[PDB]
């Protein structure tokens, strides 16, 4: 058995690229000026976007498998383009009269357009084409990273001078990216030896002391009463009411799912300890629960179902998981038991954050300009409250986290403190119609996929750096920190 | 089936496949002196009553189960009359 997997070097990939389709693609030119730079542009694009995945979710949401099939494809086209253009050209002003805007659309949304499953990777890849292609062949400029002459062995020495280890600012990405790369490569490495190896003692007693610490159930015959006794967007605008206000029905829906999880955990903790201390024919699931209780990872019985029921999947057994579940029930209880609406809502605790926002939308249409405003006419916006120390329409959200700059006057993050708090981003809704702005996503978990995209936030704070600088930098406003 | 035998004893349409009547006519002759209705007459359904009386009086059932395995406890739980009417004289667990 022999393994011959590839390395993660920019030169190494670039040098290999320069030993796949060479000495007949490079020598059959009939032009040393224009398309020679076009080849150099696409192969540099090729080696950069492939190596970008080294960092992880910051560079690419999921791994993609770009290969030369797209590269040597991208070539066959621009050749057919340039041959048919110059077939009617009886004389070249300066080596060409090309209008290189079609090649953008193609290299952007076709060749590497097949693998892309995410939406954000679309414009992210279009931005890379913009900064690298320049929309023109300058002939005389410094690549952000040098620029070639027109000889083959010159390309080899060009590749020879390239440094071995580079810095992520060649991708436009921040220098602190080295940390998270080691960490995830660290994590997945241990995770494998955690599978080389895959007990009935005091540990089951420790869990026995645990199940008398999680909060009790909320009997619906009481909860249906509670949500119905009191509820309203503002005490002055309306009397107490239940079903009609979107925030009370959201209260109910959240208490149901919370109760659904609280019942399962209390039961499985019991039946796990009620097999040795108690008596029952041993269950494979209970045995899997015992092994998970000893280790750090919670059992699958609380995270996934045959199709999927992700609830609060966090890493440790009790360090954060039961901590997060407790905090959710705590903030849900005072949101219920006292029944008043507190300031500084915690968006992470809610299972469905989107319904919270659309509920706010409906609230504004009903309470305000009602009639004057229709639900299809209201649009969404946000004003981030640039303050530390401190109702009106909109909400106050707590616990957001930014990555890579500050709240306002966004600057370069220091070496440490990769994840930074996000200040109070009060919301704002207005009816429609009644390019300096940068748009950011909001991901629930740090996995950064198409799902968990709750809403998008316009972040106008630019100064001298255009938003494309931030787009390549991959800034985002995530919610959890794990 | 054995649970319904314990409880009622009348198997649905097993002794009633055109045979209950002939079987009971083969017992009315014992009936006439057993119940002793002044040695005068009898009836029809009461003959079946006395027949089920006789069969449940003279049908003893001994069930002998394993204490170990997986099925015994859940079988007892599925059938209530199994453990219930049946007296439990408990065989000693081979003491010393």
């Amino acid at each position: 058995k022999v393994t011959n997997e590839p390395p993660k070097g920019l030169k190494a990939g670039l040098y290999k690229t320069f030993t796949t389709i060479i000495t007949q693609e490079f020598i059959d030119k009939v032009d040393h000026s224009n398309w020679r730079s076009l080849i150099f542009t696409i192969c540099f694009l090729h080696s950069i976007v492939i190596e970008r995945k080294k960092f992880g979710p910051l560079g690419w949401c999921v791994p993609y498998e770009y290969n030369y099939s797209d590269l040597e494809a991208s070539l066959l086209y621009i050749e057919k383009y340039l041959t048919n253009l110059m077939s009617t050209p009886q004389p070249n002003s300066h080596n060409l009269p090309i209008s290189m805007n079609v090649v953008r659309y193609m290299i952007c949304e076709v060749q590497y357009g097949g693998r892309i499953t995410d939406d954000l990777d679309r414009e992210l890849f279009i931005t890379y084409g913009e900064t690298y292609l320049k929309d023109g062949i300058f002939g005389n400029d410094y690549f952000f990273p040098q620029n070639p002459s027109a000889e083959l062995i010159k390309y080899q020495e060009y590749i020879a001078k390239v440094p071995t280890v580079d810095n992520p600012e060649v991708f436009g990405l921040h220098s602190n990216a080295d940390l998270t790369f080691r960490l995830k490569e660290s994590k997945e490495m241990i995770n494998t030896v955690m599978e080389t190896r895959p007990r009935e003692e005091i540990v089951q007693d420790k869990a026995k002391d645990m199940l008398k610490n999680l909060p009790p159930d909320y009997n619906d015959v009481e909860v249906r009463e509670l949500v119905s006794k009191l509820g309203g967007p503002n005490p002055k605008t309306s009397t107490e009411r239940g079903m009609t206000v979107p925030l009370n029905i959201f209260l109910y829906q959240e208490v149901t799912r919370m109760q659904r999880v609280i019942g399962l955990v209390r039961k499985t903790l019991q039946d796990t300890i009620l097999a040795i201390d108690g008596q029952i024919i041993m269950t494979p699931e209970i045995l899997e629960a015992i092994n998970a209780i000893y280790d750090a990872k919670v059992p699958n019985s609380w995270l996934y179902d045959p199709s999927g029921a992700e609830i609060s999947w966090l890493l440790p057994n009790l360090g954060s998981w039961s901590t997060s579940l407790s905090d959710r029930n705590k903030q849900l209880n005072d949101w219920l038991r006292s029944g008043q609406r507190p300031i500084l809502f915690w968006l992470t605790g809610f299972f469905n954050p989107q319904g919270f926002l659309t509920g706010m939308k409906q609230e504004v249409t009903r309470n305000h300009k009602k009639e004057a405003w229709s639900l299809d006419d209201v649009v969404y916006s946000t004003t981030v409250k640039e303050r530390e120390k401190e109702p009106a329409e909109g909400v106050y959200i707590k616990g957001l986290y930014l990555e890579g700059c500050k709240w306002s006057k966004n600057g370069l993050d220091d070496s440490d403190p990769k994840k930074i708090f996000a200040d109070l981003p009060i919301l704002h809704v207005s009816a429609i119609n009644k390019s300096n702005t940068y748009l950011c996503p909001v991901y629930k978990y740090p996995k950064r996929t198409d799902k968990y995209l709750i809403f998008r936030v316009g972040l106008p704070c630019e100064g001298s750096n255009n938003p494309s600088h931030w787009k390549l930098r991959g800034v985002a406003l995530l919610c959890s920190t794990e | 089936y054995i649970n319904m035998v314990l409880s009622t004893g009348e198997i649905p349409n097993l002794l009633a496949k055109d045979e209950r009547e002939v079987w009971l006519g083969d017992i009315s002759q014992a009936y006439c002196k057993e119940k002793n209705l002044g040695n005068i007459d009898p009836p029809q359904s009461e003959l079946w009553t006395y027949f089920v009386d006789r069969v449940r009086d003279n049908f003893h059932i001994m069930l002998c189960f394993s204490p170990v395995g997986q099925k015994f406890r859940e079988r007892a739980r599925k059938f209530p009359a199994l453990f219930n009417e049946c007296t439990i004289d408990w065989f000693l667990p081979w003491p010393e």
Partner: protein
Amino acid sequence: SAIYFTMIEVSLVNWMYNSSLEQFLKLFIESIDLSEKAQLPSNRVKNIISFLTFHVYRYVNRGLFEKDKITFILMMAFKILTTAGTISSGDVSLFLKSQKQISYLEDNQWLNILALSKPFFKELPDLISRSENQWRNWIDKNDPENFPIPDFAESINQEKEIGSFISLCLVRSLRNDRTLIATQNFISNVLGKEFTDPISYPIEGIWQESSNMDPVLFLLSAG
């Protein structure tokens, strides 16, 4: 025997990491043929432990993947120490799985305080650890293990029979960021620095192993 019961469980992490005991027997009998007998049999017995480990070690690495390189070396250390040093499986699980007191440190760090708090781990999170006199620079300094050694238990770090495993439980609980260069460190200590070094298979040399009666498998990756 302790070494062999390590390469068995690597078949459980992934298929195709499967091999017999006969191949290990040929590797074992060979290792005695290669460099075992020169003179002074007792020192040659210690030449077994130095050479036998490296021979089987490099043989399994030829079929290992990149994400599995530091894995197999980590268990070989543990399985070696599960018999001689009598390392507790509970302490092993403490090294694999795991705040009111400290105020300056972060909630992300406070999770790790409650992580380490729950022998003397439950005895030195007090004012000794809450001194906050020079360890603040230590937590700030990159590579916290090498130059600015924690003096929390100096003598326990000097003994080194278990002080390595003690320092690694401290490193992982405090700073999971630098767990892995530290993983190379104590692997290089307990087993020798000759395991933490680059390897590259000369395909000319690999051809020498391949007789006519055995094929050459190739577990490749994309690109």
